[PDB]
Amino acid sequence: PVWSEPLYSLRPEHARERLQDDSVETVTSIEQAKVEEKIQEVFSSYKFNHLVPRLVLQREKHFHYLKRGLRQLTDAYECLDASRPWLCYWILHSLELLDEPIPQIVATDVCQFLELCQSPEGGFGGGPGQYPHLAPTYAAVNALCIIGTEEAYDIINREKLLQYLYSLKQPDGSFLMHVGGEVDVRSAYCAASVASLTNIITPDLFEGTAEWIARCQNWEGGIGGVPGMEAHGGYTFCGLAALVILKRERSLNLKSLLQWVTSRQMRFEGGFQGRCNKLVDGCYSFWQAGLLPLLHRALHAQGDPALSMSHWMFHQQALQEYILMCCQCPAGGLLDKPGKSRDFYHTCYCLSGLSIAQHFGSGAMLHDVVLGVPENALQPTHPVYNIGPDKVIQATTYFLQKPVPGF
Amino acid sequence: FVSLDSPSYVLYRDRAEWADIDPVPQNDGPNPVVQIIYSDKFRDVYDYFRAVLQRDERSERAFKLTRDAIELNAANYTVWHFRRVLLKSLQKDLHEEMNYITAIIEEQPKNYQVWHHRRVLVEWLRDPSQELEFIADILNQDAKNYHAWQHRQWVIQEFKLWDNELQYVDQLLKEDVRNNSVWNQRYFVISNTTGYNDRAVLEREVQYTLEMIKLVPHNESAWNYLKGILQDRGLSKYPNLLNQLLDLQPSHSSPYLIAFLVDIYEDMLENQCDNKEDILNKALELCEILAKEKDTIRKEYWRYIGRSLQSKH
Numbered sequence: 001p002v003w004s005e006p007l008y009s010l011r012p013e014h015a016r017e018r019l020q021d022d023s024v025e026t027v028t029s030i031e032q033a034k035v036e037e038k039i040q041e042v043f044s045s046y047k048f049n050h051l052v053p054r055l056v057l058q059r060e061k062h063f064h065y066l067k068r069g070l071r072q073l074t075d076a077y078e079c080l081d082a083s084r085p086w087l088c089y090w091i092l093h094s095l096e097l098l099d100e101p102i103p104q105i106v107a108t109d110v111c112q113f114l115e116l117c118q119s120p121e122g123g124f125g126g127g128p129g130q131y132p133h134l135a136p137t138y139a140a141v142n143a144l145c146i147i148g149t150e151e152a153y154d155i156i157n158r159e160k161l162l163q164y165l166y167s168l169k170q171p172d173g174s175f176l177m178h179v180g181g182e183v184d185v186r187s188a189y190c191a192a193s194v195a196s197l198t199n200i201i202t203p204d205l206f207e208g209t210a211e212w213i214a215r216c217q218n219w220e221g222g223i224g225g226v227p228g229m230e231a232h233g234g235y236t237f238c239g240l241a242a243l244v245i246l247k248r249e250r251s252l253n254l255k256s257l258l259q260w261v262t263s264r265q266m267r268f269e270g271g272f273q274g275r276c277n278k279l280v281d282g283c284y285s286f287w288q289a290g291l292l293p294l295l296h297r298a299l300h301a302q303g304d305p306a307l308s309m310s311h312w313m314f315h316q317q318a319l320q321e322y323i324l325m326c327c328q329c330p331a332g333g334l335l336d337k338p339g340k341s342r343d344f345y346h347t348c349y350c351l352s353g354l355s356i357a358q359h360f361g362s363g364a365m366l367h368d369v370v371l372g373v374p375e376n377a378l379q380p381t382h383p384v385y386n387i388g389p390d391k392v393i394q395a396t397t398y399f400l401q402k403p404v405p406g407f
Numbered sequence: 408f409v410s411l412d413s414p415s416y417v418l419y420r421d422r423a424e425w426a427d428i429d430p431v432p433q434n435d436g437p438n439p440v441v442q443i444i445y446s447d448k449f450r451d452v453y454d455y456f457r458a459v460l461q462r463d464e465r466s467e468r469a470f471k472l473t474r475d476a477i478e479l480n481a482a483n484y485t486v487w488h489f490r491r492v493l494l495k496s497l498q499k500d501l502h503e504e505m506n507y508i509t510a511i512i513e514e515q516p517k518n519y520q521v522w523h524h525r526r527v528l529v530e531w532l533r534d535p536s537q538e539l540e541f542i543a544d545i546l547n548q549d550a551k552n553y554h555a556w557q558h559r560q561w562v563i564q565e566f567k568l569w570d571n572e573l574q575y576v577d578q579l580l581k582e583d584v585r586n587n588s589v590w591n592q593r594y595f596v597i598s599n600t601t602g603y604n605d606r607a608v609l610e611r612e613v614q615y616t617l618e619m620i621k622l623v624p625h626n627e628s629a630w631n632y633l634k635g636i637l638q639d640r641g642l643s644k645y646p647n648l649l650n651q652l653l654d655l656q657p658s659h660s661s662p663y664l665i666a667f668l669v670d671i672y673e674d675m676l677e678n679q680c681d682n683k684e685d686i687l688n689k690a691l692e693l694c695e696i697l698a699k700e701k702d703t704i705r706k707e708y709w710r711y712i713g714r715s716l717q718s719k720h
């Protein structure tokens with residue numbers, strides 16, 4: 001029947017996926033068990049014996065939450081006063097994924113605001129008058145690209161942006177997050193992202209970077225913030241995406257990376273954790289699951305004859321079940337896990353992750369798996385930049401028509 | 408002097424010692440977006456921080472102002488940079504600043520800026536005498552704090568404080584053997600001290616890990632560490648390991664054990680092993696079992712492995 005759709009998480013054998021603590025309790029198993037207990041309750045609320053209604057992505061509720069946040073925010077967001085370009089990006093990309101048009105007035109206002117955030121030394125800061133920082137710079141550039149108008153594109157001072165990147169480049173190949181700031185893999189990704197999109201990459205800008213990133217891959221197979229540190233989905237996404245932009249994916253052990261990320265999907269919850277033995281979280285639907293399309297592309301380039309031609313190498317259905325059933329806030333917006341507060345960051349990445357889980361693409365091969373009502377289908381997102389693929393092509397085409405600042 | 412929550416706290420626009428400088432409001436434009444409705448105290452502090460910054464005023468009053476700005480938003484890296492500039496300009500006592508950052512991190516241990524500020528101070532002072540104990544306290548509150556562990560690796564490596572870290576690692580593993588951050592520190596310590604090429608060290612580690620596995624068979628961290636310290640040389644290089652895992656097969660099975668067996672078979676086939684056909688069939692059988700019953704969440708991965716094995720052998 002079209003009005004009933006069996007779910008992976010609701011199968012009777014699924015109960016076997018519950019944690020086995022071997023009768024040895026530690027803070028880790030206790031916390032994991034608590035999450036699982038809550039998730040099981042949620043899963044059960046969507047099942048009525050043999051009747052299993054199609055899951056629904058609450059588009060309109062999410063839309064109103066996003067539309068409102070794009071203009072104003074409560075003082076609850078004072079903690080993000082140095083990350084306003086991020087709020088712009090998270091909200092615009094969420095609307096984009098939801099295929100919600102952006103009013104011309106709103107678009108121009110966003111452009112004007114991001115212009116005010118741009119530093120005379122290059123790059124963007126967390127707000128007007130703040131020093132530039134690679135994180136908000138990455139966010140601002142993506143936001144301007146989502147808008148995709150010549151007005152948005154031209155706001156970027158490319159000459160100063162390139163000089164700014166140079167001012168953060170370290171001799172070992174790494175980048176500072178900002179002047180006098182800390183260094184970790186996030187900087188390499190932020191720099192490669194904005195530089196490739198705006199066509200300002202010089203032959204020496206990323207010299208040594210690929211090697212520095214490879215040094216960040218550890219014994220686990222994943223990538224840490226800096227050499228020697230624990231593998232984390234966030235830093236692993238940053239590292240691999242940056243290497244893909246640089247066309248240096250081969251610098252990593254792709255085998256140990258693949259096995260590591262696939263292990264990060266939780267057998268019971270269906271979502272992904274950020275690191276081994278920690279908890280499931282909706283935002284990792286992108287940071288972790290997003291690594292599979294990147295790995296697929298990397299292996300494909302190498303002529304891997306065993307690659308799938310229809311699915312990513314993770315449980316696409318399970319991830320959609322976790323997101324749709326456990327990460328939606330009744331009032332609009334998405335989240336980390338049941339019981340947590342909604343925020344634009346989780347709204348952005350839960351949706352980004354849902355889109356990746358719904359769409360497979362490799363060569364001329366396209367295969368969609370949209371769980372629930374057909375309207376759940378989201379617009380596709382580019383695995384490297386996390387903005388629409390159409391937006392990537394349009395932006396790169398536009399900037400490729402401009403010269404690299406001073407060659 | 409006075410905190411933002413102190414009963415006698417006074418807004419900067421009301422302080423006589425600040426009457427000589429005009430505040431600089433934030434320019435969000437005529438039609439603002441993502442506009443935060445700041446509290447009066449939040450806006451007040453920042454209107455003055457903007458004035459001092461724009462004025463590049465290296466003063467004691469500006470220095471104290473940064474403390475309030477930080478309390479209002481510890482993630483404002485622009486404020487931290489300026490505070491740092493003032494620390495140098497005013498030749499402030501760094502040990503005093505260390506006591507300050509210590510309290511700040513205790514309140515907000517997951518903030519990037521506070522940890523970097525502390526690193527800078529330790530670098531300026533070239534004094535790591537308080538580091539290991541301070542980090543230990545933070546970790547005593549959250550044993551997996553990523554920034555805490557990162558700062559710890561930096562201090563140990565930069566000042567060569569390796570002597571007692573393995574003992575610290577063993578203590579935390581006793582407290583929670585599932586703490587992946589600790590297993591990572593273990594690899595960090597050994598790879599940077601004795602290394603794993605010393606066969607006596609490798610044996611000790613393999614034995615230690617195997618015992619932890621038998622104690623908590625479903626603890627993934629131990630399994631990952633076991634593969635982590637043997638993968639580079641090649642899992643097929645340790646014939647006894649395969650047999651010992653095979654014996655635990657019935658009375659200790661788990662997707663982790665079965666998966667490790669496939670990893671061994673993979674490496675074996677990659678090294679022209681004897682009974683190639685037999686090893687291949689075993690591996691394919693296990694991939695199917697993992698895909699269909701024991702590790703279904705990873706069905707696509709295991710099917711992929713099955714197909715890879717076939718395309719290679």
Ligand SMILES: N#CC1CC=C2CC1Oc1ccc3cccc(c3c1)N1CC[C@H](NCCc3cncn3C2)C1=O
Pocket residue numbers: 083086135186234281283336345517
């Ligand atoms: N950089 C970085 C990160 C460090 C740690 C992360 C995510 C993470 O990813 C992020 C991407 C973009 C971001 C933009 C502005 C502020 C962010 C932030 C975090 N922070 C700093 C930390 C604080 N709490 C985040 C809590 C959080 C929520 N979900 C996962 N989380 C872990 C928070 O919201």
Ligand SMILES: CC(C)=CCC/C(C)=C/CC/C(C)=C/COP(=O)(O)OP(=O)(O)O
Pocket residue numbers: 135138186189190232233234235238273274275278279281287517551552553554
């Ligand atoms: C471009 C850009 C800015 C990317 C950021 C990517 C990202 C998500 C990084 C996470 C790094 C980190 C320190 C996680 C630990 O936080 P935690 O202990 O709160 O989370 P956990 O329990 O899930 O590990």
Ligand SMILES: OC[C@H]1O[C@@](CO)(O[C@H]2O[C@H](CO)[C@@H](O)[C@H](O)[C@H]2O)[C@@H](O)[C@@H]1O
Pocket residue numbers: 214215216217218219220221222251252253256257598635636638639
């Ligand atoms: O995931 C293992 C894989 O990572 C590399 C780097 O690409 O090395 C990492 O892991 C080793 C342990 O397996 C560490 O000695 C090394 O420091 C760390 O960078 C590859 O060499 C390895 O195959």
Ligand SMILES: [Zn+2]
Pocket residue numbers: 281282283284336346
């Ligand atoms: Zn999250």
